[PDB]
Amino acid sequence: SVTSDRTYYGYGDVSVKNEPVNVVVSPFSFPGANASLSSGGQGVFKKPDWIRVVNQSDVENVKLEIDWVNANQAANYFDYARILVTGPNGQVKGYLSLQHGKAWITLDAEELREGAVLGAVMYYEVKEGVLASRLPLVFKVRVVETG
Amino acid sequence: WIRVVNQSDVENVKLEIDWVNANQAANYFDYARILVTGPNGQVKGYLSLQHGKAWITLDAEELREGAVLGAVMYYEVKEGVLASRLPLVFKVRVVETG
């Protein structure tokens, strides 16, 4: 009588919700307070706690691409500007200048285990006589690959 | 969802489930996959916008305790579509029994 259609089923579901990374930012105001910057002046500014990376319990490798997009603008104001991106635990993984504007800071599973804080060190010299107020520098952070 | 109640005589049933308005829900959904949960954890049926016919059959051990057919649906509503009270109608056919 009944000729059973021999076909049973099994199923499953996978939930991919979050993105691997969170770039929490604390922007810098470099002349700061209780310090001063003059026109034509030379020196160094540093912020130790600038870009924080927070990852899920699953992600263990990240490769970030930092990009300086308005570098053609700060060229009209600065003579040399060299940004050093201080890595997790004293490592320095990044270097940005008016000429060379792309960095490739990558992070491993030991560094992500304790929170990757990316401070910034800046070496500068304001072009001769230029006087400005609240100049912006904007950096593009791209997560290129992860695992 | 679908309960099968049989007489004390019937012990084998072969049902054909058919999705008839699948050409309509295509205008609204991107993928729709219905899984017909069989009697005691078995899964005997699968319906999609493309593949619309199922052949869930039932044996004498399963009919002895009542065959309840739940439904699991995986869906994604097409981009931006806004609707209210859409119907999906399934044809249940008893093809053979004994």
Next chain:
Amino acid sequence: SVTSDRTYYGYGDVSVKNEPVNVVVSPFSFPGANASLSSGGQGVFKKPDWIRVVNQSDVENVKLEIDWVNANQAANYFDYARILVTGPNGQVKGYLSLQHGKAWITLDAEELREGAVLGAVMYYEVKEGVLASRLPLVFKVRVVETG
């Protein structure tokens, strides 16, 4: 006698009512009160609470496209204008300028769980001598994909 037409039926209904997202706006009046903007002036303006996203209990991923449509108009008035769209919890996901006018801020399930407030930071310099009153800047918000 009766030759039963063996055909029974089962049915169901699905109710899709709402759209995934609500863009609640609090527009900005940037010269504000108890502050002042001058012609040819330079500086920064910021509004922390500008675009609020409210989602249903079902939606967990949104990808928004922000677009600056009258950027060709503010070019006649401004020298540089750079809008930074401050994301949910300190992240910065968006950048709009007179040249580059499209942004792609996307949001994950952890950020939508607490309300995505999109503040705005603006860096500007009014072209030399231009004097205007109540200039509009209009941004197109598009929900491109969701799930």
